[PDB]
Amino acid sequence: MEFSVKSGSPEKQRSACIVVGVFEPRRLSPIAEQLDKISDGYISALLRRGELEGKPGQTLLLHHVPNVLSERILLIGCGKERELDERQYKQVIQKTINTLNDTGSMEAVCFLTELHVKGRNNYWKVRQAVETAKETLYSFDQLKTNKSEPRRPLRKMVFNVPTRRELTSGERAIQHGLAIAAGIKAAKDLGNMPPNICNAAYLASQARQLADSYSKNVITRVIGEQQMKELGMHSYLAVGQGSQNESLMSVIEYKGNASEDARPIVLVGKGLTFDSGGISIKPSEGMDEMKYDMCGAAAVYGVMRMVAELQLPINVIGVLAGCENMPGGRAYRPGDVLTTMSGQTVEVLNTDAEGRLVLCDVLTYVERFEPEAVIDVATLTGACVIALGHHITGLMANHNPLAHELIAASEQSGDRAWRLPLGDEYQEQLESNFADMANIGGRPGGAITAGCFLSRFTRKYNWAHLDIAGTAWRSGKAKGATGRPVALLAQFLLNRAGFNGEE
């Protein structure tokens, strides 16, 4: 659907539906009781009758309202005025979009973006409304055969801003919100696709199409197994040795800045299109969710699509490290000692800790880009899920300023991350009697030792690690990819590009 911003009163609107809010208890909102006084207390009369107490989730749809230009007035329960946090705000917009679609409204004017949301300005509210509206419309039915497509008469939504002063921030919010929502959808699509269709070659193919769609700034390269071997990326090669799928590393280069002294921000996404655990096989229960083990590449692709659309004035390189981990007569095994691209040797203790064996070689490989900073994004350890659950991404880094920036972006964007420490006592857990290091450190500090492992390959540049094992998708009835952390990364890049989201 389309979005736009205007600055006008409810009573002057001539829409299929205007949306205004109501707070507990049956407390018409400022903007709404502007409309009440047009219909002569018609609305407040209905609220005295108990038609809408204002509880969250509650709604009231009025037709043929006395002296109201719009055909419908949709009132939404907003809880309690300032006492509105971002989370309840997102729900109010979700409800609005869903309610409107059970209606015949082909468009609507929404005054909810004017609500007081603790600490968030106009830009944030409009941007979050767009991102939430789009999230609500998501569906993954491309593999179903029944389905007669969903009902969506709502084709456009206009968000109202307080004064003409907010139209500018309002428009920026819409532009940004749509590009990030698109990056999120793309990542959710790639994540939800089965390993059956979304394999390393499928990712390479999406990478090429992205370049074709933005040929003035995007160039894609795809490195195969033979080139990997020539480059000495034996660790990455070992992981996919067992699978019949070819390991393919897709490099998407976006050039938005022409000065010769510009340095690129490199994003490295773990792309295990399926992870069975390998010889160190995973249990049966819920293993189909391992199709999400490539959600890091999914997010990096979404971010690139976002950067290209917004044409940011910076240089970004996204790597989709495609691979597949399968058991078999050619599978690598516990006990193997791999010679990484960097030259350091790694003793494999568990073949299911393969993401870091793919990433280490990509981390050495990306130094040819002389990056400003490298950030890897990966569904890496179950330990991180135990540590930070499904709500916050785990972050580790070898440079404090870069960590601070990523955490600030995670908060601004509402796609949170939390820093976990690295450190010598944890490095020691990787000691090996046979190679420079082992690929695991045992249960204690599992998410930290994995980051420590990665840090031995990133000493030549400032770097951060995002472990999205718990935030990349949900299980249960609503099993599905979240698209995280596209928003955190998009915010990060928006900040780097100079945009002031605080104004």
Positions at the binding site for Mn(2+): 270, 275, 293, 352, 354
Alpha carbons 374 and 461: distance in angstroms, whole number: 7
Q: Does 131 bind Zn ion (CB under 5 A)?
A: no
Exactly one of 6, 116, 118, 434 binds a copy of itself (CB under 8 A); that residue is 434
Q: Does 150 bind a copy of itself (CB under 8 A)?
A: no
Q: Residue 497 CB, nearest distance to a copy of itself (Å)?
A: 28
Positions in 282-301 near Zn ion (CB under 5 A)? 293
Q: Quick one: the chain helix, strand, coil %, rounded to 5?
A: 40, 20, 40
Of all residues in this chain, which one has the CB nearest to Cl ion in the complex?
Answer: 328
Q: Does 449 bind a copy of itself (CB under 8 A)?
A: yes
Q: Residue 91 CB, nearest distance to a copy of itself (Å)?
A: 12
**Discontinuities in the chain (C→N > 2.5 Å), after residue:** none
Q: Residue 316 CB, nearest distance to a copy of itself (Å)?
A: 29
Positions in 327-366 near Zn ion (CB under 5 A)? 352, 354-355
User: Whose CA is closest to 251, among 208, 287, 302, 296?
Assistant: 208
User: Whose CA is closest to 292, among 378, 209, 376?
Assistant: 378
Residue 337: what are its φ and ψ, rounded to 5°? -120, 115
Q: Which does 50 bind (CB under 5 to 8 A by kind): Cl ion, a copy of itself, Zn ion, none?
A: a copy of itself
Between 3 and 274, CB nearer to a copy of itself: 274
Exactly one of 36, 135, 253, 275 binds Zn ion (CB under 5 A); that residue is 275
User: Whose CA is closest to 288, among 301, 278, 273?
Assistant: 273
Q: How many residues bind Zn ion (CB under 5 A)?
A: 6
Between 8 and 104, CB nearer to a copy of itself: 104
Residue 155 appears among annotated catalytic residues: no
Between 313 and 328, CB nearer to a copy of itself: 328
Q: Are 129 and 160 in contact (CB under 8 A)?
A: no
Q: Which does 272 bind (CB under 5 to 8 A by kind): a copy of itself, Zn ion, Cl ion, none?
A: Zn ion
Positions in 374-433 near a copy of itself (CB under 8 A)? 383, 385-392, 418, 420-421, 423-426, 429, 433
Write out the two tokens for 41. Answer: 């207390």
Maximum Cα interatomic distance, the chain, rounded to a whole number of Å: 84
Q: Does 61 bind a copy of itself (CB under 8 A)?
A: yes
Between 96 and 280, CB nearer to Zn ion: 280
Strands 107-110 and 156-160: parallel
Residue 496 belongs to what H/E stretch? helix 486-496
Give the range of 3-11, 184-192, 271-279, 328-336 binding Zn ion by CB under 5 A.
271-279
Q: Residue 276 CB, nearest distance to Zn ion (Å)?
A: 8
Collect all residues with Cβ–Cβ distance below 8 Å to 220 and sequence separation of at least 6: 204, 207, 208, 210, 211, 250, 251, 252, 253
Residue 333 burial class via C-beta count within 10 angstroms: exposed 0-12, middle 13-18, buried 19 and up:
middle
- What track of x and - describes contact with a copy of itself for positions 252 through 291 (by CB under 8 A)? ----------------------x-xx-xxx--x--xxxxx
Q: Residue 229 CB, nearest distance to a copy of itself (Å)?
A: 16
Write out the two tokens for 100. Answer: 């409107």
286 HSE (CA, 13 A, CB side): 10
Handedness of CA 193, 197, 201, 206 (dihedral sign): negative
Q: Which does 143 bind (CB under 5 to 8 A by kind): Zn ion, Cl ion, a copy of itself, none?
A: a copy of itself
- What track of x and - describes contact with a copy of itself for positions 96 through 115 (by CB under 8 A)? ------xxx-----------
Give the range of 4-12, 141-149, 182-190, 403-411 binding a copy of itself by CB under 8 A.
141-149
The catalytic residue among 55, 221, 263, 282 is 282
What is the Cα Rg of the chain in Å?
Answer: 25
350 HSE (CA, 13 A, CB side): 17
Alpha carbons 230 and 238: distance in angstroms, whole number: 14
Q: Residue 283 CB, nearest distance to a copy of itself (Å)?
A: 9
Q: Residue 293 CB, nearest distance to Zn ion (Å)?
A: 4
Return residues touching Cl ion (CB under 5 A).
Answer: 328-329
- In the three-class reduction of DSSP (H, G, I as helix; E, B as strand; rest coil), residue 187 is classed as helix
Exactly one of 156, 255, 263, 333 binds a copy of itself (CB under 8 A); that residue is 333
Residue 397 belongs to what H/E stretch? strand 393-397
Alpha carbons 131 and 361: distance in angstroms, whole number: 35
Q: Are 149 and 137 in contact (CB under 8 A)?
A: no
Strands 107-110 and 18-23: parallel
CA 64 to chain CA centroid, Å, is 42
- In the three-class reduction of DSSP (H, G, I as helix; E, B as strand; rest coil), residue 492 is classed as helix
Between 243 and 379, CB nearer to Cl ion: 243
Q: Does 480 bind a copy of itself (CB under 8 A)?
A: yes
Q: Does 272 bind Zn ion (CB under 5 A)?
A: yes
Q: Which does 258 bind (CB under 5 to 8 A by kind): Cl ion, a copy of itself, Zn ion, none?
A: none
Residue 282 appears among annotated catalytic residues: yes
The catalytic residue among 26, 120, 127, 356 is 356
Which positions are annotated as active-site residues?
282, 356
Q: What does the binding site for Zn ion look like in residue numbers (CB under 5 A)? A: 272, 275, 293, 352, 354-355
